[model samples]
Target: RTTRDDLINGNSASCADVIFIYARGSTETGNLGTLGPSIASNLESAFGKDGVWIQGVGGAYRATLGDNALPRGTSSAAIREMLGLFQQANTKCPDATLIAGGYSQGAALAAASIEDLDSAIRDKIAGTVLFGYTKNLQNRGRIPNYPADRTKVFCNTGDLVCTGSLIVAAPHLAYGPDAEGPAPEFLIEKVRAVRGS
Candidate 1:
């Protein structure tokens, strides 16, 4: 059987021009669920499936936090693993580009990964998008030093999780149908322009 790290690092068979890392939201944290996959699909619609790869990385940092809601830094195992894989891809695939982001709590993790990537790898990233990210919680409200032009944050106008305006879950759930425009509007066009999607 393929080990977990083997999956995280991917392989030459699926080595791609664009390595897409998708982190899952809290409620829809399943490997198949979540907005990250939706974002990936939208990109593929135009980009085609030939040179793109995606990995769903999430869950508890300790592996004992149940299916969901382990709090911050409690599911860091996948984030760091993704970072390592990204770096390896940089080494193994010189021209490959990185596209990554998440929603809600997953946004916090993906944003942190993007921020922590080595400066060299950070420069290779084509885009970052976050929806319903928890801004105030754990000081993750803002992604510092990220290139504003290359990042798009969708808080759904009044989503309090990222905006801290009001306590409601509706906007957070709205991205299911609401995300196609802005999320891609933020990064997809840029990635296509840069990576020739």
Candidate 2:
């Protein structure tokens, strides 16, 4: 039930060639204020306000019954919503690339969306940025490795939240760094280096 206006309010020049889908920690849709600002600021500094689009799948924290014990259906819905957002953004910026990002639970959801992406659009994904995720959510011996050289995982060494789990549910294809706070610069550098753009 979230709309584009609910996530973004400004109207700047179209300088962004990428869309950033931010995932909040364990909180409801409206509470995304928790990490939205930091992610937005970091992204703006890295890509310029006009060159980046920020969006989020609100209420992604609802837990339900099923395969992962985390409301698989709700997660699926959010994934679909993300794809829809991508499609909408693409319509506005046809040549723009798409990037997925999340923290904690939001990171987990971003990983799930990457795994569930349709083959046609899968390659369009520039990269994924995840924070506070552990190996449990992204098991090395799991289904579908993260698309090689296109995924980045950032976890804080001191963050016990991601280190204590064994879910291996997120897109565990690529793993890197365990830091804290917003680090969009680090992530953008990886993407630019990988894509050579």
Candidate 3:
């Protein structure tokens, strides 16, 4: 629910550890759906309120006819919005860490921005996680632009759309907010490592 104005003007972000950007499946609200929120909730369980969480704020991202159009190239409406938050967090809290991630299309946008971020912004990233991610990025090996040590991907075994290998839709909707999955573990481990540092 955090917005650009909240991140830009909020007082608690001054000493946060990670600015988390959660982009949901290419749904209507660009929400983090269940997977993103579940992971974030786990982070909060361990870190309490130490992290700054931001949800992607855009549209359905239908090429050019939805709530927000997908940006050309590696940028998108969601990416642009997330980048602004990153800038604000960096400016306001230089020591704070950042984590960019999402599901399905949201995962694409998160990876796109994380992949091309300048060192100034990239260095602050602590982790990246994606659920049901498209295979196009995976095929090109452009998962997330973070250190391989900090990135996690959990596109179910049968997820064809994310595999960029198939167009099956069932698996894409399977990475829900369940705690008994690789994504939750991946998120918990990453946050543990980041904060433990």
Candidate 4:
């Protein structure tokens, strides 16, 4: 009987209508981090608590300073763990529309997770969201492989992390609030679109 927070590392078991796999920022305690919980909470509000399943990347890769120093922070174990979480959702919740997201270095990991997804798996993802994404500048404000329409990045102005730099700024920390409205709204719309209801 794992607790809600313990459902990290792709341990989620219930089949939900929507499955959201999140990655936390560097050095943040807990797998969902600060930003992910707000985003997940809002989704639960809109979708009903039982309608959504949440998982955070926490296996081989634990968000840390060393991992954050890498290229867009995607060269660490986070990517592999993130991908595994997505794969797990694909299998356990066959009818669910998937949503992937993260903040800062975790955002980089989330984007990287979908880089080579099988088309069948990619098709299950309703949308992806990144906040204070470290690769925003390098990727030209887009998620490399995912469709622009299905990807949303919320980068506060002056967030140096998103400018292809490693410097963390106040803007980077502000995403916790951004998740309250902007992040959840975008994802809700994507889920709605997926359901066509």
Best by TM-score: 4
Measured on C-alpha atoms, candidate 4 has an lDDT of: 0.79
Considering only N, C-alpha and C atoms within 3 Å, which residue pairs clash in candidate 1? Answer: 61-74, 61-75, 135-141
Worst 10 residues of 1 by lDDT: 59-68
lDDT winner: 4
Whole-model Cα lDDT of every candidate shown, in order:
0.62, 0.54, 0.59, 0.79
Q: Tell me the tens digit of each residue's lDDT in model 4 across 53-100.
A: 777777776777777767656665677777777777777667789888
lDDT of 1 by residue, 72-181 (tens): 43255756755775677677666777777777666776776776788888888888777777654445455655676777777776677765432556767788764566
List candidate 3 segments past 4 Å from native: 1-9, 12-14, 28-30, 50-55, 58-75, 136-141, 165-168, 177-181, 192-197
Q: After superposition, how far is residue 95 of candidate 3 from its true place, in Å?
A: 0.9
lDDT of 3 by residue, 60-119 (tens): 233222422334223455566666666766777777667766666666667776765677
Candidate 1: residue 103 lDDT (0-100): 70
Ranking by TM-score: 4, 1, 3, 2
Give Cα distance to truth, residue 78, candidate 1, Å.
4.4
Q: After aligning candidate 3 to the native by TM-score, how far in Å is the CA of 165 from where it should be?
A: 4.9
Instruction: Kindly provide the TM-score of model 3 when superposed on the true structure, using C-alpha atoms.
Output: 0.75
